[PDB]
Design an enzyme around this catalytic site. Structure first.
Site, PDB file in Angstrom:
ATOM      1  N   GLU A  17       0.953  -1.280   0.015  1.00 21.92           N
ATOM      2  CA  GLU A  17      -0.228  -0.028   0.060  1.00 21.92           C
ATOM      3  C   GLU A  17       0.833   1.207  -0.169  1.00 21.92           C
ATOM      4  OE1 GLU A  17      -2.850  -2.403  -0.281  1.00 21.92           O
ATOM      5  OE2 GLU A  17      -3.402  -0.200  -0.471  1.00 21.92           O
ATOM      6  N   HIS A 173      -7.513  -3.358   0.355  1.00 18.75           N
ATOM      7  CA  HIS A 173      -6.785  -2.343   0.325  1.00 18.75           C
ATOM      8  C   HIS A 173      -6.044  -2.010   1.773  1.00 18.75           C
ATOM      9  CE1 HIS A 173      -9.742  -1.713  -2.843  1.00 18.75           C
ATOM     10  NE2 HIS A 173     -10.358  -1.124  -2.161  1.00 18.75           N
ATOM     11  N   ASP A 178      -5.222  -8.412   1.919  1.00 13.93           N
ATOM     12  CA  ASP A 178      -5.094  -8.408   0.430  1.00 13.93           C
ATOM     13  C   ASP A 178      -4.072  -9.335   0.091  1.00 13.93           C
ATOM     14  OD1 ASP A 178      -6.938  -6.422   0.005  1.00 13.93           O
ATOM     15  OD2 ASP A 178      -5.641  -5.391  -1.375  1.00 13.93           O
TER      16      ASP A 178
END
Ligand SMILES: [Co+2]
Ligand SMILES: [Co+2]
Lengths: 204, 202
Positions: A17, A173, A178
């Site tokens: 991220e 996210h 994820d």
């Protein structure tokens, strides 16, 4: 048989991220990694999960829209963020151990839309001056492409669902969630190919 | 048609590039070929239309002797028959747009071996040529190195083709035309094999 399965490549599932699409200027904020193993019957499954929150590197750019997308607050004092050096050094080290312990020679990133995650990992490794990078510098296993082939879906959530998996948008996210969904999807895709008789090709 | 249903509206187009180096921003694009695909009555994937261009190095482009030694290209050959990047891409995008309309897809996706490389070079050349309405998706690709890894356990093009039972001629390798055709047949074989073994439809 793990290192036989992809000709010496040691697959590691990764998700990142970030605070933007620009790998050289934009902050890395979070990274998770999942190593894989093969049982005795030759089925693929998750081995070890690593997860780190990452402090924006000094002078890093931050895009508001990226933060809105991933919901991360960089200054959140309970984030438990570490330097990109500390996060990547430990991920690299666990991967390096896995490699020589299994008979592979190089690691390969498995990720959804892999060139994104790969570019950011490389840029952060460069910034941290990490000398020993076990990951192949350009090769990846993009699960978006793999899911396109196997499930006719390229979007992670839809792919997992079509695959018959759980998926919760509430948790998406986020690197940890994820990466875990991606690992199970990859394993499912590979395992299914084996069940269908796609693997092995011949004796060996 | 069935093609556009197979990949949720994505129109798969096979691309290969030859370059004068690994930097998509600063190194010259030298060759590009494109092969669109079609699906027959039984639902097997196969090559449709083939385009190929030799590309003139853009003004200010860098050149790595090692890359040129490898692919044997000499950008100052009296008659490479080379055209500008704009010319090649304009023609490719035109044929591709036609394909999208006729088949009922809504976007194109690049199929290439180590697709990120070819994709970045193609995008850079497009920006450079100030082309708009690029039918190709800006992020998504179908990387045959990953697909061949799954299906064949091979990530190297020549090896994957041979492992799949195809011929691979090292004497023709590293020409946009030859590599693109091998990549297209490899991709079709992989998609077709998945179907053959009962992986598709779901
Ligand atoms: Co960093
Ligand atoms: Co050009």
């Amino acid at each position: 048989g793990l290192c036989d399965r992809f000709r010496g490549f040691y697959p590691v599932v990764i998700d990142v991220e970030t605070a933007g699409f620009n790998a050289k200027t934009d902050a890395l904020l979070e990274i998770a990694a999942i190593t894989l193993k093969m049982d005795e019957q030759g089925w693929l499954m998750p081995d070890t999960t690593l997860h780190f929150h990452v402090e924006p590197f000094v002078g890093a750019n931050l895009q508001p829209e990226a933060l809105a997308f991933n919901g991360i607050d960089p200054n959140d004092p309970d984030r438990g963020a570490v330097s990109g050096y500390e996060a990547l050094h430990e991920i690299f080290k666990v991967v390096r151990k896995g490699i020589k312990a299994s008979g592979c020679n190089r690691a390969i990133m498995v990720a959804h839309n892999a060139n994104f995650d790969h570019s950011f990992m490389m840029a952060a490794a460069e910034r941290a001056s990490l000398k020993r990078n076990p990951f192949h510098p350009f090769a990846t296993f993009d699960t978006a492409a793999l899911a396109g082939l196997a499930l006719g879906q390229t979007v992670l959530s839809k792919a997992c669902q079509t695959a018959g998996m759980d998926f919760d948008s509430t948790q998406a996210h986020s690197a940890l969630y994820d990466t875990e969904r991606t690992a199970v999807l990859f394993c499912e895709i590979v395992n299914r190919w084996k069940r269908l008789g796609g693997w092995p090709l011949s004796a060996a």
